[PDB]
Amino acid sequence: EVLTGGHSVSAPQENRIYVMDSVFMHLTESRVHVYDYTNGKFLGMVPTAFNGHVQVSNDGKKIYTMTTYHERITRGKRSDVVEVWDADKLTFEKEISLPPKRVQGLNYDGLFRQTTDGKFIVLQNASPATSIGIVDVAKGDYVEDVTAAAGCWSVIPQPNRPRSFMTICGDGGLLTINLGEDGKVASQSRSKQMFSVKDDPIFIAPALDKDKAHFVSYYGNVYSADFSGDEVKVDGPWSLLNDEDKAKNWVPGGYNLVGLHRASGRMYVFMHPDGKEGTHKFPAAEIWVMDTKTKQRVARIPGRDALSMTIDQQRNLMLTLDGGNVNVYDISQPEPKLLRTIEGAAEASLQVQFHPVGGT
Amino acid sequence: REVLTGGHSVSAPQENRIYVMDSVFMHLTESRVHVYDYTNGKFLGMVPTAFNGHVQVSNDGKKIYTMTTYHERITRGKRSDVVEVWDADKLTFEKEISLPPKRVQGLNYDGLFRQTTDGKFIVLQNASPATSIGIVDVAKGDYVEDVTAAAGCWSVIPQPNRPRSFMTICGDGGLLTINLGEDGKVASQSRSKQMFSVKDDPIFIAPALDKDKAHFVSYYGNVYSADFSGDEVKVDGPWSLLNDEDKAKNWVPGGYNLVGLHRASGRMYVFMHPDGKEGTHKFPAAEIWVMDTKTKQRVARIPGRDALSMTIDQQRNLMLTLDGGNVNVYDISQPEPKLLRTIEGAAEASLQVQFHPVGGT
Amino acid sequence: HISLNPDLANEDEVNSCDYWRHCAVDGFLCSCCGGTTTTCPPGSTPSPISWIGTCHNPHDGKDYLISYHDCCGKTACGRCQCNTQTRERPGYEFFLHNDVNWCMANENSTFHCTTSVLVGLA
Amino acid sequence: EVNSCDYWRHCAVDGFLCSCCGGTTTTCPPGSTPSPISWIGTCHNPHDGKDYLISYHDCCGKTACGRCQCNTQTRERPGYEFFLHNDVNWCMANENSTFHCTTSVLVGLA
Ligand SMILES: *C(=O)Cc1ccccc1
């Protein structure tokens, strides 16, 4: 026999999920674990150094990572980068230099995203002053720094426009940025106030539809942003809670804690009882399934102490993640059905993502 | 009210300190040294050591020496193998000494990263995979040159009775002695007669080291010795660790840094387990046996606490043992060791613990 | 007032995630890492910036501003990990937020441990 | 059965089985690089009762796989018999020496 390299991942792209393992206990050796969700098989991994972030290109061909190096790890010159990796060979292809202020923090989706057309990577900076950075994928270059987003946080792409995204700002409204084909800001707009920052703060994680986004609050309310037009229209609150729910102090909790099934308008939310100040990152006692049209709950199921989730629209799936284990659910009907659990997919992960199949 | 400050020294005095080399094999690029107070189990600090670090303390007790490998982008880019000099009390980085890109990458046996008795040279194992011994001039902050004469040999056993001499174990079953000049180059060398049969009775590399001799145990429970009191090294052995009852239950040694010598008494300490056969030479200790190397009899046996590695402090009459994660402290001032405490969770994956040197001149 | 002076208190109390001033810690307590509540372990560097929490002191009944400075430039301490979230808010209220690395502006941003510096009455 | 440390071919593995890491007994996981050098074990085949030479080439240049860790030592010897020895990183001569996982390549009859 002869040992060979150069091999591709053994399962088709449509089977693949990406578990971002922060390895917080040894955060300089964070990595992405690649799994087959259909059978739980480990397929490969991508090393991501100190506190890596990850996403897959919208066309499915590449994996993008974002990380920080230093010449001698704990001393020497800092290099913040985006890396482009081949999705099938899981090999490094190119490094894109960033200014030394890419966000270092837990793996919320909105810290490292891309435009709908896949031509620009859109990432959060903190120095600790905040701005949004734009990377031109074709050119392999950092091309724009959106300082207009100072005092805002996270990136919510608009799926109905090629190069537009929103961010949540300290005034309780949303700033929308429309990039030109060169990756520079072509226009921008600010919504009216959506939520009271002091009285009803929202979780940053969107339940994202094609032309609107919903957000849940620390106290179990829902706010919506409609971007069917150039100007974003905001509304809410409506409450996730009925009177019985309120009596037991049910509130949302988690990190990447919501999801939307676009075909039905069902929104999924991690919830727990006995809510009070300080419980907003508690593991799910339950997943609630909300009809966003009628603004009423339709189902509730055990939460399996999950903290983060993600949705695949075309196969009608939801993954949930408790830090170490990934649960696979069929959401083709209003009540989710648990298909399997992948044990030990990570040591410290708060983010899982499907390989894209929808193209650009 | 309050203000956060840095720049502080380690809270406990040097004589209280031990160094647990945590390989963190599950995340081997973030290996580190954990510094503990052995008198109370308090965590005192740490030194980061990147990929598969090795560690030792300077003989004079002032500095910590580490050895490690970096690459420009960790898993790609240019390789830099280095020795680093750290201040022992502030646990801060002071100096990087460049090595050729072939320092040994491997588990933390003492003999892979040592120093001459006079403290003037660091002496380390290279493998490219061709083996040589590397010499670092501490005063100059420089790599001297490969000791190529040690090709086909392994590990460094310093001679405590000479300022800049050491031995290594060779594939012929003998020992090569290297005597350095004041500049760190080889001044002279000599090769002993065969000490052990490589095929029939292989020895563990871990020495039980005295001032002018060293003992080694074998896979099958035999003991070999090398006397370097004289001009050249005189070898002898085997004698057996085992009596008939021992032999009947197939007791053999097992572990990594698995032996120690209490020099004042001549007592040798060794991890042992029953039901020995091919493949059990790294099994955790069922017991520790205490051997009188003059009478060649066992004088004590105690529970092993699944230990794999040990170290001895001659100055305080202590033995530490280590099972991979937990450190046991023993008083060895009498033939039977007495267990003082266990430090739980000192490491995730450590095969080497060391005292901060006290005295030793 | 021992409740305001952790160095005088029981080490086991101060090294607990339930200690009153640790009410918005996401990290390893520096007091379990060879430092104290207000000093970095040897060879780790204070962060000039921090998230801030408001914590209630049950001993004297008053509320205090706490600044959660990190110690930086050494790899993860790994001891006494806490994830407490009293009054913590998301990144659009950035200096109340603890899911970011407050070592982010240090000469070396590697996160070692986090502590709780008493600033004053809230 | 190939993912178990007790599988006969893994008789001197000190590392992570590549077959648990997105590879196989004889192929590296995607994006990890074979080592040109290795330690060798002699392992007993429980079917035909003969001993075989197994070459433990590593896969290198990615961080630790972390799955199916084994530490078996049949006929393993110390560093003075260097190519029988498994307490060293057999990725040591690769372009990137970071250890990912260990393969178990059948060479032939011992
Ligand atoms: C606080 O600074 C600890 C931390 C580090 C990195 C990410 C999140 C939190």
Ligand SMILES: *C(=O)Cc1ccccc1
């Ligand atoms: C085999 O190469 C695994 C290994 C790596 C590093 C040190 C020891 C063993």
